[PDB]
Amino acid sequence: GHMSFKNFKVVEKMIFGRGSFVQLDDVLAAQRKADDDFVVFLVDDVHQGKPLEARIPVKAQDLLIWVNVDEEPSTIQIDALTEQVQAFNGKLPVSVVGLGGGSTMDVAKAVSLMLTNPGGSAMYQGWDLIKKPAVHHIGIPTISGTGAEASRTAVLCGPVRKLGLNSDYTVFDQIIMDSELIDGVETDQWFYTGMDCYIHCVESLEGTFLNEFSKAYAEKAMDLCRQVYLEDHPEKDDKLMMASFMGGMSIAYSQVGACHAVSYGLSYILGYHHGIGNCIAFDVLEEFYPEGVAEFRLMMKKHNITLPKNICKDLPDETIAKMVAVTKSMGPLWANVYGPTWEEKVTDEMLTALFRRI
C-alpha cells in the first residue's frame, strides 16, 4: 500500500461577474433537451417581493419553491421538498437551482441528491454514502461567505444533529457568482456570514492539518476579508464573493478548529445560526486566536456590530454540559488546534468556562 492524498473534486464550471445572473436562463436552456423539461428553483424566501424575484427565469413548466431559512436546513425538510418535486412531475427535473445563502444552496445540493438516491437524507449523512450522481445542480449565492457554493457537503440537521452529506456527487455542476445579488444584504448578516469566511481562515491557518494549497487559498481569502471589513473599496461585493469562493476552495487540505467546535454546541443546543454563532464563539477565543480576535474586534467597531452577550450566564448546568459534550466530541477539530495530545487539553472544565463567557 501507499498513503493517499485526497483527490479533490471542484465545481467544474463557473461564471464570475456582476450582472451574470442574466446568463442563468441560457445555462438552463442547455439542459432542457425536451420542450417540457423542467427546472426546480429553490430560492431563499427573502427574495420574495424584491427585485430579484421578477428576474428568476421561471418557465410555465418549472417549479419554484420559496425556501424559508428561519431555521437552517434539516433532513425532514429535505425529504419533504424531494417528495414535493416527485409529486410535481413524473420526470426528473433537468436541473436544480439553489438561489440563496449557504442554507438554500445546501437545500438545493441535498434535493438534487435525494431525487436520485432513495431512503431519505439522514441515511446519507456521513462520508461518501451517496451511491448515484445527483440531478444537475447550480449554485447562485445571494449572500457571501460560507463557501458552500464550492464545497462537497450539504449540512443538514438530522434526527440527532447537524452533519453533512459529504460526497463528490454533492458538488455543484455550475456556480454563478454575481455580486449584484449580495449588494442589498443588511449590515449585521453581511458581517456574520462574511465572518464565517474570515474565522474559518484564521482557524485553518493555525491548524496542524494544512498544506500550501489550502494555505494560499485561506491567506488570500483572509486578505480579501480584511479589504472588505477594514477598508473601503468600490469592489467590496466582488471581493467578498471572491473571498467566499477561495475559502471554499481551501477546505480540501485544511480543517476548522476551536471556533467551529464551540459554535457547533451553540447551534445544536441553543439554535444559534451558523454565522452569528461563530462570531459569538470567536469573541471568547482570544487565547486560541489572539491576532484574529483582535482584528475581528476592530472590524466589529468599524461596522457598529454588537454581539449579544450573557447568553449562557443563567442557563442550567445541564444545558451547558450538553454543549460541552457536543463540542468536546469534535476530535478532528481539536486535533487541528493542539495535535494528537488534544484530549489532555480539551476538558469539560476548559469548555464550560468558554460557554459561561458567551
Note whether 56 binds a copy of itself by CB under 8 A: no
Partner whose footprint covers residue 62, from a copy of itself, Cl ion, ligand NAD, none (CB < 5 to 8 Å by kind): none
- Nearest approach in angstroms of CB 192 to ligand NAD is 7
> Do 75 and 122 contact (CB within 8 A), yes or no?
yes
CA 274 to chain centre: 8
What is the number of other CB atoms lying within 10 angstroms of the CB of residue 135? 21
Binding-site string for Zn ion from residue 176 to residue 215, where x marks contact by CB under 5 A and - marks none: --------------------x-------------------
Note whether 4 binds a copy of itself by CB under 8 A: yes
44 or 295, CB closer to ligand NAD?
44
Task: Give the number of C-alpha atoms closer than 13 A to the C-alpha of residue 235, restricted to the C-beta side.
Answer: 9
3-state secondary structure (DSSP) of residue 165: strand
13 or 131, CB closer to a copy of itself?
13
191 or 272, CB closer to Cl ion?
272
Partner whose footprint covers residue 14, from ligand NAD, a copy of itself, Cl ion, none (CB < 5 to 8 Å by kind): a copy of itself
Helix (H) or strand (E) holding 215: helix 212-230
**Of 75-83, 90-98, 180-188, 228-236, which part binds ligand NAD (CB under 6 A)?**
180-188
User: In terms of Cα–Cα distance, which of 337, 241, 323, 233 is closest to 281?
Assistant: 323
Q: Alpha-carbon distance 177 to 319, whole Å? A: 40
Site for ligand NAD in 87-116 (CB under 6 A): 100-104, 106
3-state secondary structure (DSSP) of residue 183: coil
Note whether 173 binds Zn ion by CB under 5 A: no
Note whether 337 binds ligand NAD by CB under 6 A: no
Helix (H) or strand (E) holding 66: strand 63-67
User: In terms of Cα–Cα distance, which of 94, 95, 68, 93 is closest to 80?
Assistant: 68
3-state secondary structure 117-161: CCCCCHHHCEECCCCCCCCCEEEEECCCCCCCCCCCCCEEECCCC
> Do 58 and 3 contact (CB within 8 A), yes or no?
no
Note whether 142 binds ligand NAD by CB under 6 A: yes
Residues that bind a copy of itself (CB under 8 A): 2-17, 19-20, 22-23, 26-27, 174, 177, 211-213, 216, 219-220, 223-224, 235, 238-239, 241-243, 245-246, 252-253
Where does this chain bind Zn ion (CB under 5 A)? 196
**Residues at the site binding ligand NAD, with contacts judged by CB under 6 A:** 44, 46, 69, 72-73, 100-104, 106, 142-143, 146-148, 151, 153-155, 181-182, 184-185, 189, 193, 196, 274-275
